[PDB]
Amino acid sequence: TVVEEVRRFAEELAEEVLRVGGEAMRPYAEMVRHLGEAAVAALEGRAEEADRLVRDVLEMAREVGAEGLARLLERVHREARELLREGRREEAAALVLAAALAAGAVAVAEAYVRLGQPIRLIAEYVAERLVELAELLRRLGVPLRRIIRLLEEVLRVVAEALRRAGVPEPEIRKVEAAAYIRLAAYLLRQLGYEALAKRLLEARELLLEGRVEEAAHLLEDVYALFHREIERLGFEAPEELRVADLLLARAIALIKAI
């Protein structure tokens, strides 16, 4: 069912891209669909069809004008080759799926920016998509640290896209910080820290409304309590606590830099 899940994910993202953007950007739907096909090819054997499809999507990125997507696609090409030589298949499909998500998200984000919708919608959209992708990659079997690295790459591509569309920098920082707080809350919820997740999401809501100062104050309070809890456990803690610590630190840094 895994390859069916990858196909469904790619097709749903392409349909949403077409619905939001119409026929103005049909290329992005083709990129999403071919990257879904390359991913399922990698999951079902093969190593050369994946290379060819990734090169095709790289050519489309070259002609359309997507720069960050093109760079990410070259990186997917080289890595996917290396890990397919090494015999590991899940991680190559993981890189391809992250590439497809980057393409869909850049399409939808540029659509939202062109027709002037508020930044809350872009931020919530990207955060929810990242959480869904993280759930999928957890289902496949990729290790968590690689998951977070892929998600940060996707966020970087989306931020570059929003920069090219003229969105002011503080709004881009708000988008990224919202994504980081959502990811941190998602990680914290699995281990059974519900109150922590609610406080983090309250801080996120105060951030998306433009109340930066109350967001920073509530974020620093919840981070202080969390960090005391971390130092309680000494030289032992589940890895998701360790990753959430860095996610929360980066979120705080971004909010302070707004």
Q: Which of 221, 233, 242, 253 binds Zn ion (CB under 5 A)?
A: 221
- Taking the complex as a whole, the smallest distance from the CB of residue 43 to Zn ion amounts, in Å, to 18
Identify which range of 51-59, 84-92, 101-109, 118-126 contacts Zn ion by CB under 5 A.
Answer: 51-59
- Taking the complex as a whole, the smallest distance from the CB of residue 146 to its own copies amounts, in Å, to 13
Is there binding between residue 257 and its own copies (CB under 8 A)? no
**Residue owning tokens 């097709």:** 11
How far apart CA 135 and CA 1 sit, in angstroms, is: 15
Interface characters, 225-254, with its own copies (x: CB under 8 A): x----xx--xxx--------xx--xx--x-
Is there binding between residue 30 and its own copies (CB under 8 A)? yes
DSSP state of 63: H
Interface with its own copies (CB under 8 A), residue total: 46
Instruction: Give the N- to C-terminal CA distance of the chain in Å, as an integer.
Output: 43
Q: Are 130 and 40 in contact (CB under 8 A)?
A: no
- Taking the complex as a whole, the smallest distance from the CB of residue 210 to its own copies amounts, in Å, to 12
How far apart CA 101 and CA 173 sit, in angstroms, is: 20
Identify which range of 9-17, 147-155, 208-216, 240-248 contacts Zn ion by CB under 5 A.
Answer: 240-248
Q: Are 158 and 178 in contact (CB under 8 A)?
A: no
Tokens, residue 5: 């899940």
With CB under 5 to 8 Å by kind, the binding choice for 132 among its own copies, Zn ion, none is none
Tokens, residue 200: 């983090």
Axis-axis angle for helices 27-43, 67-85 (nearest 10) = 10
Identify which range of 89-97, 130-138, 180-188, 212-220 contacts its own copies by CB under 8 A.
Answer: 212-220
- Residues 41-100 binding its own copies (CB under 8 A) are 48-49, 51-53, 55-56, 59, 78, 81, 85
Nearer to Zn ion, 12 or 56 (CB): 56
Is there binding between residue 214 and its own copies (CB under 8 A)? yes
Residue 200 region by backbone torsions, left for phi larger than 0, else alpha for psi between -120 and 50, else beta: alpha
List the one residue out of 168, 70, 52, 84 whose CA is nearest residue 119.
168
Q: Cα angle vertex 154, ends 71, 56, to 5°?
A: 40
Tokens, residue 115: 């027709």
The footprint of its own copies (CB under 8 A) covers 21-24, 26, 30, 33, 48-49, 51-53, 55-56, 59, 78, 81, 85, 111-112, 114-118, 121, 195-196, 199, 213-214, 217-218, 221, 224-225, 230-231, 234-236, 245-246, 249-250, 253
